[PDB]
């Protein structure tokens, strides 16, 4: 799923050095991105959406239940007229991407946080350089407005989601020559108000300066689409305890890269449950975070973990692997990882996995382990006392693995909270109704706005008409659509047309055809008694 | 031939609710300091306060496009008053004939949005054509935008001097 955000604002009317405006260059770049992505044999399941800088009823051009034909037709007729309302457009796009999330089961907020339930989405937000306006002045903060929150959105406290990356294109093409071609293989950043918003999600922001640089950035962007598993790392709290082959001193601490969870839907178990201590009676649930604040500690702690535990291959995208490569990729050794923010009743973090590398030393495998592996792996009334340290709802998925061996547990203590189940079906129904109402009025514009609003300065109610583009005057049916110049000739033409008594008469003077004239479409409505047997 | 005394006279006229004579004497001082606006006006003759007083004079004189053009002579363009003036519908300054003096992309974008909102396609097309110029692109190396801005300043100041007195 790819949602292209093209502003089509009035500031996108300035002409480049090639002769076309920035909007035409953006549309051409989108078309070349389409034809480049079509090369990879994986573009048979994705869906394209379009978002412009227009009113909430008119911002979306093609959303759910819209094929490629209507999407291309809407992107073709894009007009650059309006202000640069970036915040409202980003909010509308994020709400559109989060319409079918509370109904299928993604981010249920009650049963862990399953990383194998993915809904990838990439935003391009092709906008102008700077100087965004909000009908009052020029702002320099880019704060997303919060006026009408969706039902069930206060449990994340952030507009974007687990898998929602945000790339940006500014299209800073000069007007005279664009002769800046010193650095060949180098794509700098835009350094604008959208740069922090993009970096928070996990995607960079390109700075287009030349058509060659545009082609380079488009060819570099097609290689950044996969399953979205974005997790945040922190150096705390080990004081860079990497004393293995050298001495530490770094910027590879707050790594917020993605992870490629390739399927073999995705197959996996043992998710990151949450970051708080869930109580048995809690009417209000604390809001989750889109990026989990999980921290790693550099300790050997028996990296050899061999068992019949179901295996996972959530591949990690190499972005800050320099710190690992400095220590020879940690051969035959790993380092634990633990989620912060009160992972248990009374403690600060519980190691639930590690980041052991592969034998090929190519990337990090991201070995996800159970909540507390070094205890259950090595019954004398031990498991009954051990199952009290883990979160309650967490007994859900692990028991499935126990199904591979037997079934000692039951549904006696399989209860998260009596108040968490309530006020959940109503929120899901409200979200479904909102998604249906949004998908219903998605393409039907029905503007019907043509007036001059004649002010005084039949009274207080007059309004002069405006020039209608698609008027289609009926010359043979309506007599008012016949001007004075070609009146007598048109009169004789109408007379001859009425006195001819032909078959299948029409009221159009000369209606040649539409913009498209297909050969197969016209040849299908015919009959040819021939087969060419010879 | 003294810019200081002309500025003092213009300020005195502005204090007595005389805006036309204030603009007259302001343009007179501008023609005294710089030779008929052929060169850039000195920063001490036309300060921020003088340009703000010119904007105040042109605002109450039913000249809103002139206000929007004058809001670009400041060190920092005040878009609030420009958008407040361009929103009026009782201008007396040939709105469609002063769009060539605007070299700011934000003001032209706001003009295009206002013309599209009110269904004024004739002026909306003029605004878009003014945006699609090669001189102003908001991406030049600043050696071209400054020259075009100075040329438009000279042209607008000479037109305003031909208008008054």
From Swiss-Prot, chain A:
Transmembrane segments: none annotated. Residues 1-225 form the VWFA domain. Widely expressed. Expressed in heart, brain, placenta, lung, liver, skeletal muscle, kidney and pancreas. The keyword Phosphoprotein applies. GO terms for molecular function: protein-macromolecule adaptor activity; transmembrane signaling receptor activity. Its main location: nucleus. The keyword Nucleus applies. Induction: Frequently down-regulated in nonsmall cell lung carcinomas and prostate cancers. Down-regulation in prostate cancer is due to CpG hypermethylation of its promoter. However, some involvement in cancer is unclear. Component of the Integrator complex, composed of core subunits INTS1, INTS2, INTS3, INTS4, INTS5, INTS6, INTS7, INTS8, INTS9/RC74, INTS10, INTS11/CPSF3L, INTS12, INTS13, INTS14 and INTS15. The core complex associates with protein phosphatase 2A subunits PPP2CA and PPP2R1A, to form the Integrator-PP2A (INTAC) complex. Belongs to the Integrator subunit 6 family. Component of the integrator complex, a multiprotein complex that terminates RNA polymerase II (Pol II) transcription in the promoter-proximal region of genes. This is Integrator complex subunit 6. It comes from Homo sapiens. The chain holds residues 3 to 599 of 887 of the full protein.
From Swiss-Prot, chain B:
TPR repeats lie at residues 3-36. Component of the integrator complex, a multiprotein complex that terminates RNA polymerase II (Pol II) transcription in the promoter-proximal region of genes. Component of the Integrator complex, composed of core subunits INTS1, INTS2, INTS3, INTS4, INTS5, INTS6, INTS7, INTS8, INTS9/RC74, INTS10, INTS11/CPSF3L, INTS12, INTS13, INTS14 and INTS15. The core complex associates with protein phosphatase 2A subunits PPP2CA and PPP2R1A, to form the Integrator-PP2A (INTAC) complex. The WFEF motif is required for the recruitment of protein phosphatase 2A (PP2A) to transcription pause-release checkpoint. Belongs to the Integrator subunit 8 family. It is linked to Neurodevelopmental disorder with cerebellar hypoplasia and spasticity: An autosomal recessive neurodevelopmental disorder characterized by global developmental delay, profound intellectual disability, seizures, absent speech, spasticity, facial and limb dysmorphism, and subtle structural brain abnormalities including cerebellar hypoplasia. This is Integrator complex subunit 8.
């Amino acid at each position: 799923i790819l949602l292209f955000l093209i502003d089509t604002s009035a500031s996108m009317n300035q002409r480049s050095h090639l002769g076309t405006t920035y909007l035409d260059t953006a549309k051409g770049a989108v078309e070349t991105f389409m034809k480049l992505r079509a090369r990879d044999p994986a573009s048979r399941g994705d869906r394209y959406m379009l978002v412009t800088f227009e009113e909430p009823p008119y911002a979306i051009k093609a959303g759910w239940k819209e094929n490629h034909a209507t999407f291309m037709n809407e992107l073709k007729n894009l007009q650059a007229e309006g202000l640069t309302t970036l915040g409202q457009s980003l909010r509308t796009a994020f709400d559109l991407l989060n319409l079918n999330r509370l109904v299928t089961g993604i981010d249920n907020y009650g049963q862990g946080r399953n990383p194998f339930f993915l809904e990838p989405a990439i935003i391009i937000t092709i906008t102008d350089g700077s100087k965004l306006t909000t009908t009052s002045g020029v702002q320099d903060e880019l704060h997303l407005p919060l006026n009408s929150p969706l039902p069930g959105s206060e449990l994340t406290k952030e507009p974007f989601r687990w898998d929602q990356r945000l790339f940006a294109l500014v299209l800073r093409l000069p007007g005279t020559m664009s002769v800046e071609s010193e650095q060949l293989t180098g794509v700098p950043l835009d350094d604008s108000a959208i740069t922090p918003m993009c970096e928070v999600t996990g995607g960079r922001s390109y700075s287009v300066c030349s058509p060659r640089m545009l082609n380079q950035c488009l060819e570099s962007l097609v290689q950044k689409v996969q399953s979205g598993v974005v997790i945040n790392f922190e150096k705390a709290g080990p004081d860079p305890s990497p004393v293995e082959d050298g001495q530490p001193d770094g910027s590879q601490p707050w790594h917020s890269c993605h992870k490629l969870i390739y399927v073999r839907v995705p197959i996996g178990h043992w998710p990151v449950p949450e970051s708080f201590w869930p109580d048995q009676n809690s009417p209000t649930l604390p809001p989750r975070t889109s990026h989990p604040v999980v921290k790693f500690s550099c300790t050997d702690c028996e990296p050899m973990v061999i068992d019949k535990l179901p295996f996972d291959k959530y591949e990690l995208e190499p972005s800050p692997l320099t710190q690992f490569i400095l220590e020879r990729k940690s051969p035959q050794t790993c380092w634990q990882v633990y989620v912060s923010n009160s992972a248990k009743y009374s403690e600060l973090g519980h190691p639930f996995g590690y980041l052991k590398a592969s034998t090929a030393l190519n990337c990090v495998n991201l070995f996800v382990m159970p909540y507390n592996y070094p205890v259950l792996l090595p019954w004398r009334q031990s498991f009954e006392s051990y199952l009290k340290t883990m979160p309650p709802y967490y007994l859900g998925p692990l028991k499935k693995a126990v199904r591979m061996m037997g079934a000692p547990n039951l549904i006696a203590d399989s209860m998260e909270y009596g108040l968490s189940y309530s006020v959940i079906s109503y929120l899901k129904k409200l979200s479904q109704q909102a998604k249906i109402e949004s998908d219903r009025v998605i393409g039907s514009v029905g503007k019907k706005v043509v007036q001059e609003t004649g002010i005084k300065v039949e009274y207080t109610g007059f309004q002069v008409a405006l020039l209608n583009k698609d008027l289609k005057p009926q010359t043979f049916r309506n007599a008012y659509d016949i001007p004075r110049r070609n009146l007598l000739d048109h009169l004789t033409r109408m007379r001859s047309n009425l006195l001819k008594s032909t078959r299948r008469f029409l009221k159009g003077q000369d209606e040649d055809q539409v913009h498209s004239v297909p050969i197969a479409q016209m040849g299908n409505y015919q009959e040819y008694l021939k087969q060419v047997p010879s | 031939n003294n810019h200081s005394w002309l500025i003092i006279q213009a300020d005195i006229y502005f204090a007595t609710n005389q805006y036309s004579a204030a603009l007259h004497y302001y343009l007179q001082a501008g023609a005294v300091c710089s030779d008929f606006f052929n060169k850039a006006v000195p920063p001490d003759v036309y300060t921020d306060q003088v340009i703000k007083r010119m904007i105040k004079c042109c605002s109450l004189l039913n000249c809103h496009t002139q206000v929007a053009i004058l809001c670009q002579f400041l060190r920092e363009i005040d878009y609030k008053t420009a958008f407040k003036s361009l929103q009026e519908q009782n201008s007396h300054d040939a709105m469609d004939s002063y769009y060539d003096y605007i070299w700011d992309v934000t003001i032209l974008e706001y003009l295009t949005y206002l013309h599209h909102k009110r269904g004024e396609t004739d002026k909306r097309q003029i605004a878009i054509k003014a945006i699609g110029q090669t001189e102003l692109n908001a991406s030049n190396p600043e050696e071209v935008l400054q020259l075009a801005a100075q040329r438009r300043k000279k042209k607008f100041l000479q037109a305003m001097a031909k208008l008054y007195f």
